[PDB]
Every structure is written in structure tokens, then in C-alpha cells.
Point group: C3
Chain length 282, copies 3
């Protein structure tokens, strides 16, 4: 890890002295979900590039910002554009923001992402509440906590079996019902793979045999660091496509499929996340 | 990645100006299949060591060469000796040649390798056409595309579900039949593991449960880069041994088993690859 | 790999000239099993910090020592405190001691560790003889042998299917019986995951579906290097906890659970290992 405790501290103190805002809930916007930032009030924007120690977004669009504000009753800080392992960033950079949030006083992390549906029940547009995850990169050594542990952040061996807050998942299922929606709220296991290339049929079948319901290339690292910090964690995936699981299919996954899904059924998540804020204690 | 676009360009321009040859088909010879280079005509040899930017073959035998020539009607470039992740090379070095080939004007990549048979139907000597692959290293982050993407080569998120050209596999199955051969042409999924040590019984069973038919320590990376480049890709494995899958067996996999298999039934692949050239469009 | 052959040689020659002891059996003590060092006679202690080229134990307790002595009839060298991948050490550092032992004249390696039970038959306190292992990190590239091979240590492609000495496992099962013990001696497959965070329910189920009986974050690397060296290898795990495999459970794995188990049923292993020494040929 190239960061020392001081680095996280310095970045937090810089932010704290450049904004009157004091966030309680940190929200990471997945692909095509950045619009969520438009629902904040008294919003204050910070480009990642201007924040000390922040990984500088190479060239995925040069759009990487931290937005502080209020979202339906809660002091929030949103990440519009997140870092991925496939871009070349080691995991201690990918998750650097999470530890900054903790030092800012955030006690809750809401993570969202786009994902390929592995579970056949799922349909494009569906929203999957994340009940658990399979950290494939983690089994091999790509775990954000690798390296000496800093007691100031947490324990050497944190548990992850209870990573996704049970209470929030219940209130999430409730809220979705209280809203009376067409499709039911899906729930399941998210498996992380490094990417950036999409899965083959044989790989899709592997992921399915392991019991995964959705596949993506992010999230798990941030969740692990959040939990290590003691933050409450809740999240979901927007199923943007059904992964090809048989050789008969003549279609293939693409960047267009994802953002298009994250174009129409996108707003649904935005509302959901906004309303869900009221369900977050304080 | 330690290479810049210029590096691939410079290596290609160096090669293009040192040979009259202009290859269309790049062929990577697997272990004990290097003999294929003997069937080329008007052959021109280049030691890897003399080619700018090429990874210098440490000491597996100091024999690493790029051979340009004509193989049964096609302008080819063959790699005699390929780079493996287990030797210490990062994947952007292992696959460096593939991107060079693309800039040389190659539009087809034929990959061959030796592999342990996981599917019980398989027998030593069998030839398995590769229909799909499981990129285990890739799930964890060891994917040749990790790092910033260069649009000049391809997209950020390329698909791999259609990596192994359907047309070529059909024509391959045809050709094998048109030849009238003793054993049938096997077909299946190739799973890549980093190695260099051989699998344990428990690991063999894992690989089998995942749906893999053959196991090796190469190929997948080159295939991914080829596909990312837009090259047509076809390949197969020479089953050099049956991986031990039960504790009763008193035998063990060894370097001798592999090359010996790649000694007798080796020539069969050579002929097949040569004849298959006519089936490659232009 | 940052070590050259000379480095292993220099460390061995330093040790050989600082102790009259000439070990035959190297023993790696797992978590909460370090007490085994108390049963040695004519013990001579070396702090890791004073041994040339040894990885310097960061801050897990600053307690890292190499103890030479006699254990029930055998010249031993014990590692009290072992290196883990999750601490940040690359595998060539984690396994550095193993190659030193080989040069010291050791021909047998006994590895012990604490592990979570995946097999439902297992109960906290149980002892599992290791019959095989699943090297998950290894599939991805994290294999201690990655990099150029040194013939002086072993072959480029060593087999691992017979890693855990059949004879010793039999004599181990015998010894345990000759002692007449309450619980039966468990036997099974050990799966290594990098850690340091504990497994989620979904991950536990993955590990179970793969056929693993116990899960830990060490051992496999040392075993692979030992085998590559030609050493005889035997080992076992102390089941310190039952990994959560269903969402109904309201408990979670923790550092306290492990050491507590490695507190009571710990001595049982110590005796077993001591007695087992007589079963090790010479
Ligand atoms: O089929 C899939 N496989 C793996 N990841 C995704 C995702 C998730 N994100 C979306 C984004 C690519 O379009 C990249 O960062 C991965 C959507 N569909 C799939
Ligand atoms: O049983 C096996 N397991 C994994 N790879 C191979 C291979 C393939 N190549 C062959 C070569 C070793 O002999 C090394 O580079 C791996 C043949 N048999 C097996
Ligand atoms: O449930 C488990 N999962 C993974 N490893 C272990 C271990 C083994 N060691 C023990 C130690 C943590 O308490 C760390 O180095 C891992 C015991 N229980 C479990």
C-alpha cells in the first residue's frame, strides 16, 4: 500500500476545511447511475483531480467528481465515477475514498453498480439487492486489506459474512413494496471478476455453478474496506444484460447494452436510493 | 503495461523493413509442436533477441525465434517458443507479439499448445479443437488488457463469448473428416492455470467440476489480445497426458510425458495445421 | 524473485556456523501452536531479525523466531511465527525459509495451521490430517515457483499430486490409533485463500462445492517449495471454527475464536507432533 495513515487524514482534513458539509452517508454511483447526483440540494462539487492523494482518473472521460449535499434528508457525499481494478489501479487506490469517507464521519456506505445477470430469473432492467458476494480476486490475493493492518481503521481479520446490513435489506424490501412496483425487487449474490473483457460461455457457467446471481467488476473491494472500517453497508446492481450461457445464442455483451439499460431503467434506481435515505438511521 | 503504442509500432516497422514477407496468419507453436516451422518455404528466421522490444527468452533453452514464410498457400509468421506467465513475464509481455502481428497486417491467429486431459473421454495423443476457455487467472486480475485501453487496438470491454471462430471450427471438423482419421477430432473447453507446478487430485476435480476439458498454462492471454485486436482466432490442444483424478493412481505428470506425446502424435498436428491453411479465407 | 541462489546459500552457511545443530526435520508452527517449541531440548533460539536475508516480521507481535533442538529423538528446526501472503510478503519471501532448510540438510517438512472447517462432520477442536490441497492463489499466478527455475533446487514443472507423503499419513493414522483418542483423526483437503478477511456465506459454499474440507491462509506455498526441493511433507490443521454456511446463523468468525481453540485443544497437537517424530525415518 502506497498510502500511510497520514495521507488519508490529510485528505479528510483538506475536504473538511473546504466544505461546510459533513456527510453521514457515502454513495458510490455505478455505471449509468451518476445522474443520482442531480437530486442533491446545496450541492458542492470537487473534481477528483483537486483532492489531495486522490487517484487521478486517467482518461475514461476525465469525469471524476466528489459531490457533497443533501439527499432526501441525509448529508451525503457521492462518488460520480468510481475506480476499477481493470484500469490498472491497485486495490488500495480503488478503495482509498472509502477510508477518507470514514475519517469524514460517514457511517454508511451505499454502493451501486451495473451487472450481468447470471440468474435466469433476472431480466434486463431488474434491480438486485445485494445479499452477499463472492470475491474471486480476493481468493488469489487481490484483497484491499493485503499488507500491514492499521488498528486505527479496524482488525487484522474482519468478518464479511454479515457485510450487507440485514436491517437495511429488510427496509429496502419494505420500501420497494411500499412504493408498489411492477417488477419485484430481486435479491442475490454478486460475484466480482476483474475484467475488463466480458465472460465466455464456459465462464458464465462457472459463475452460475458457484451460486452467483449477478457479475460485475467492482464493489466488493469498497465493501470490504467499508466493513473493515465499521461502516453500515447496503447496495444493489442494475441488471443491464443477460450473460450468454449457451452456444446457440448469436448475441454478445457490449458497452452499448450496459449504458442503454443504465439509460431507461436508470431513474428507477435514483428514486429508490433517494427514498431509501429516510430508512437510514442516524 | 511497460509498452507504449509507439513500441509496438517501432517493432512492427523494424520487422516490416527487414523482411519482404507480409504475413496474414500468425501461428503460435505449443510445446513439442515447433517442428511446424519445418514446413514453411522461403523461410526467414529472426531470433527474438534481435527484435526490438521483444521479451528476451531467459534460459528455457535460449531458443526463441520468429519464422516468416509460406505455409500451404498462406503468408505466415510463426512463433517457435512462446512466453509463459509462470516464467515471470507479466501478461503484457507474454502477449506483446500478438499486437505486433496485428500491426504487421495479420488477421488470423492460430494457437496450439500441449494440455492435460480433464475429460475422461480423452486419450493421450488426442487433438482437442478449442471451442471455449475458462480464464482463471483473468478472474483475479491477470488479464492482458488490464491497464488503460488504447482505442487504436480495440474497445475497453471486448466480448470473448465468440472468441473461437465458429466458421473455422466447422471447417476444422470438416477437414479432419475429409482426411479420414483413426481417432475422432475432440472438441471442448480449455482452462488456463498459471502453473508451473502440476495440479493435485483435488485441483483436477475442481477443474473438472468447472466444466473444463483440457488444462494448460498458456494461450488464453494471447487469444484475448488477438480478439481485442479483431483477429480471427482458431486453436487446439494436443492432449499429452491424463491428469490424475483419483488417489488410487500411482503415476504422476512430468515434463517427459508431455514432450514424448509431443514427439509421436506431434506430426499429426503439423499436417492438420498445414492443410487447415487452405480453409483460412483471405 | 528478489533472492539469488547465493542468498539462500549465505543464510544457510550463516546458520550452520552459528549452531552445532544439524536439523533433519523442519516444523512450521501454525497459529496458537507455537508452544510446540517448549518440548525441544538443547534448544537454541535465533530471532528472524538476526538471520541474514530473512523477511523481517513487521509488527504482528515482533515475535518471529527459529528454534533448533531435539524433539523426541529428531534434530529439529522450528519456525515460531510464519509469514503470510496477506501481510504483504510476496510468496518468494513467505517460502524463503523452506529453501534455507533444504540447504541446512532438512529432508522433512511438517506443516501445521489453524483452519475453518468446511466439512460439516468437523467440530471445533478436531485435527485434520492433510491429504491434499487446492491452491486457489496458484491458479491465478500466485505460486511460489513463478519466475526462472533453479535446477539446483528442482525441476521446472514439479508434480503435486503426491505432495502429502502417503507413508507418513498412514503412520499418522496409526499413531493416533495407538494412542487411543476420544475423537477420530479427521483427514481431508485444505484450500488456501489469501485472506485476510474471513469468508462470506456465498464463499463458504463455493469452497465446499469445490471439495475442500478446511480453509486457511497459508501452508500450500511452503508445501510446494518443499516438494520442489524433494523434501518429505506431512501436515495437519486444527479446526478452530466452523465457517458460517447459511444465512440463519447469527455468529461470525473472529481472531478470538481461533486462538481460543488453539488454546485448549492446542496441546493435543503438540503431543501428536512430538510422538509422530519417532515415525519419521532418517
Ligand atoms: O455481462 C457482464 N459481465 C461482467 N460485468 C458486467 C457489467 C458491469 N460493468 C459495466 C461495465 C461495462 O459495460 C464494466 O465496468 C462492467 C455489466 N454487464 C456485465
Ligand atoms: O497435466 C497438465 N497440467 C497443466 N498443464 C499441462 C500441460 C501443458 N504445458 C506443458 C508444459 C509442461 O510439460 C507446461 O508449459 C504446461 C500438459 N499437461 C498438463
Ligand atoms: O474460517 C476461517 N477462514 C479462513 N482461515 C481461517 C483460519 C486460519 N488462520 C487463522 C488466522 C485468523 O484467526 C489467520 O491467519 C487465518 C481459521 N479459521 C478460518
Amino acid at each position: 500500500n502506497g498510502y500511510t495513515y497520514e495521507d488519508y487524514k490529510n485528505t479528510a482534513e483538506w475536504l473538511l476545511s473546504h466544505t461546510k458539509h459533513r456527510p453521514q452517508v457515502a454513495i458510490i454511483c455505478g455505471s449509468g447511475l451518476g445522474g443520482l447526483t442531480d437530486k442533491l440540494t446545496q450541492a458542492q462539487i470537487f473534481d477528483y483531480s483537486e483532492i489531495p492523494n486522490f487517484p487521478r482518473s486517467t482518461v475514461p472521460g476525465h469525469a471524476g467528481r466528489l459531490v457533497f449535499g443533501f439527499l432526501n434528508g441525509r448529508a451525503c457525499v457521492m462518488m460520480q465515477g468510481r475506480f476499477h481494478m481493470y484500469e490498472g489501479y491497485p486495490l488500495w487506490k480503488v478503495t482509498f475514498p472509502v477510508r477518507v469517507f470514514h475519517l469524514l464521519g460517514v457511517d454508511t456506505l451505499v454502493v451501486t453498480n451495473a451487472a450481468g445477470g447470471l440468474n435466469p430469473k433476472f431480466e434486463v432492467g431488474d434491480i438486485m439487492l445485494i445479499r452477499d458476494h463472492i470475491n474471486l480476486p480476493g481468493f488469489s490475493g487481490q484483497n484491499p486489506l493485503r499488507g500491514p493492518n492499521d488498528e486505527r481503521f479496524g482488525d487484522r481479520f474482519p468478518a464479511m459474512s454479515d457485510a450487507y446490513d440485514r436491517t437495511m435489506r429488510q427496509r429496502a424490501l419494505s420500501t420497494w413494496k411500499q412504493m408498489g412496483e411492477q417488477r419485484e425487487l430481486q435479491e442475490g449474490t454478486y460475484v466480482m471478476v476483474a475484467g475488463p473483457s466480458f465472460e465466455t460461455v464456459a465462464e458464465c457457467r462457472v459463475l452460475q455453478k458457484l451460486g452467483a446471481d449477478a457479475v460485475g467488476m467492482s464493489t466488493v473491494p469498497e465493501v470490504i474496506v467499508a466493513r473493515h472500517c465499521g461502516l453500515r453497508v447496503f447496495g444493489f446492481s442494475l441488471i443491464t444484460n443477460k450473460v450468454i450461457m449457451d452456444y446457440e445464442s448469436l448475441e454478445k455483451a457490449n458497452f452499448e447494452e450496459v449504458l442503454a439499460a443504465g439509460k431507461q431503467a436508470a431513474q428507477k434506481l435514483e428514486q429508490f436510493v433517494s427514498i431509501l435515505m429516510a430508512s437510514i438511521p442516524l
